[PDB]
């Protein structure tokens, strides 16, 4: 489990994919994940939510025609998801949020 801001940041830029401890929300649902119950570690031990498309509707991350933004959960181990997220574009710009996507700062 590569679930740290630096670990995942460095894995992405090198491997151009998330480490394997990540699964998308639809994949997690398909295994019995119920957001309201905080049970992800029960149905998907060692996994974290990551890989879905992040809309960027509010223009907070730098836009470009042909740049797609995705997200991944950081620092998660069990229970309810936290407020930590890595944001990564198709051309590997790496941003982080610690507050539920309200604010972003560059990490890579």
Sheet harboring 85-89: ordered strands across? 22-23, 48-53, 69-73, 85-89, 94-97, 105-106
What is the Cα–Cα distance from 72 to 88, expressed in whole angstroms?
A: 8
Instruction: Give me the resolution in angstroms, 1 decimal.
Output: 2.1
Here the CATH number for the domain that contains residue 81 is: 3.10.450.30
Question: Which of the following is catalytic: 16, 27, 58, 71?
Answer: 71
- 107 CB burial (10 A radius; 0-12, 13-18, 19+): middle
Provide the domain limits for residue 3: 1-108
What is the Cα–Cα distance from 102 to 41, expressed in whole angstroms?
A: 26
101 in Cβ contact with 81 (< 8 Å): no
Q: Provide the sign of the torsion angle of the four alpha carbons 75, 87, 35, 42, taken in this order.
A: negative
- Residue given tokens 């670990």 in the structure block: 7
27 is catalytic: no
71 is catalytic: yes
Question: Which of the following is catalytic: 16, 27, 58, 100?
Answer: 100
Residue 4 CB contacts under 8 Å (≥ 6 apart), including other chains: 74, 75
Domains in the chain: how many in total? 1
């Amino acid at each position: 489990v590569i679930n740290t801001f630096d670990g995942v940041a460095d894995y992405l830029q090198t491997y151009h994919k998330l480490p394997d401890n990540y699964i998308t929300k639809s994949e997690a649902q398909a295994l019995g994940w119920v957001a309201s119950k905080g049970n992800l570690a029960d149905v998907a031990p060692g996994k974290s939510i990551g890989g879905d498309i992040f809309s960027n509707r509010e223009g907070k991350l730098p836009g470009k025609s042909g740049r797609t933004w995705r997200e991944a959960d950081i620092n998660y181990t069990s229970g309810f998801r936290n407020s930590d997220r890595i944001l990564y574009s198709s051309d590997w710009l790496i941003y982080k949020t610690t507050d539920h996507y309200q604010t972003f700062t560059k990490i890579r």
